[PDB]
From Swiss-Prot:
The chain holds residues 127 to 283 of 793 of the full protein. Changing Y45A: Impaired binding to histone H3. There is a cross-link at K136 (Glycyl lysine isopeptide (Lys-Gly) (interchain with G-Cter in SUMO2)). Induction: Up-regulated in proliferating cells, and down-regulated in quiescent cells. Down-regulated upon adriamycin-induced DNA damage, in a p53/TP53 and CDKN1A-dependent way. Induced by E2F1 transcription factor. It comes from Homo sapiens. Ubiquitinated; which leads to proteasomal degradation. Autoubiquitinated; interaction with USP7 leads to deubiquitination and prevents degradation. Polyubiquitination may be stimulated by DNA damage. It comes from the Eukaryota. Changing E27A: Impaired binding to histone H3 without affecting the protein folding. Changing Y48A: Impaired binding to histone H3. The tudor-like regions specifically recognize and bind histone H3 unmethylated at 'Arg-2' (H3R2me0), while the PHD-type zinc finger specifically recognizes and binds histone H3 trimethylated at 'Lys-9' (H3K9me3). The tudor-like regions simultaneously recognizes H3K9me3 through a conserved aromatic cage in the first tudor-like subdomain and unmodified H3K4 (H3K4me0) within a groove between the tandem subdomains. Multidomain protein that acts as a key epigenetic regulator by bridging DNA methylation and chromatin modification. Specifically recognizes and binds hemimethylated DNA at replication forks via its YDG domain and recruits DNMT1 methyltransferase to ensure faithful propagation of the DNA methylation patterns through DNA replication. This is E3 ubiquitin-protein ligase UHRF1. Changing D16A: Impaired binding to histone H3 without affecting the protein folding. It is found in: Nucleus. Interacts with DNMT3A and DNMT3B. Interacts with DNMT1; the interaction is direct. Interacts with USP7; leading to its deubiquitination. Interacts with histone H3. Interacts with HDAC1, but not with HDAC2. Interacts with BLTP3A. Interacts with PML. Interacts with EHMT2. Binds hemimethylated CpG containing oligonucleotides. Interacts with ZNF263; recruited to the SIX3 promoter along with other proteins involved in chromatin modification and transcriptional corepression where it contributes to transcriptional repression. Interacts with UHRF2. Interacts with FANCD2. The lineage of its organism: Eukaryota, Metazoa, Chordata, Craniata, Vertebrata.
Amino acid sequence: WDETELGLYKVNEYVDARDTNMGAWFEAQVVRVTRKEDVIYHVKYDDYPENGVVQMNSRDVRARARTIIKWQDLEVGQVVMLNYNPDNPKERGFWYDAEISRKRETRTARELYANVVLGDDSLNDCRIIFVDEVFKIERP
Ligand SMILES: CCN(CC)CCCNC(=O)Cn1nc(C)n2c(cc3sccc32)c1=O
């Protein structure tokens, strides 16, 4: 609990924060920044006030996703943030980081596969439904 004015993100800044347990990214806001780069972010989630204030490692906080990578610009090997539902893969889910693994296209059909990063481990060759909603990851 050593308040710091250093660190990429500032108090009141609207960010993306990663839930440690699920590995998914949620819109959050920096409420406090402490130390022991390796600064600790204290965040509150925009749509989850009931989750309180959570201490985050600096790797679990980044600038909010804003740019959609269009289908034509998606490439095998790109690390992106996309929507996936691990329990119900055909349904809408949460925003996870993923490595694009396969990209297929016919005249009337498109197929996107990715290696999806979850709570701790990778889920290889997931079939991605939301091909037009793939986000570029904001990097400093
Ligand atoms: C084991 C039970 N299975 C099947 C029913 C579900 C898997 C476990 N539970 C979940 O995914 C539920 N869940 N949902 C939301 C929105 N958030 C969670 C943490 C955070 S931090 C911000 C939002 C958010 C969270 O834990």
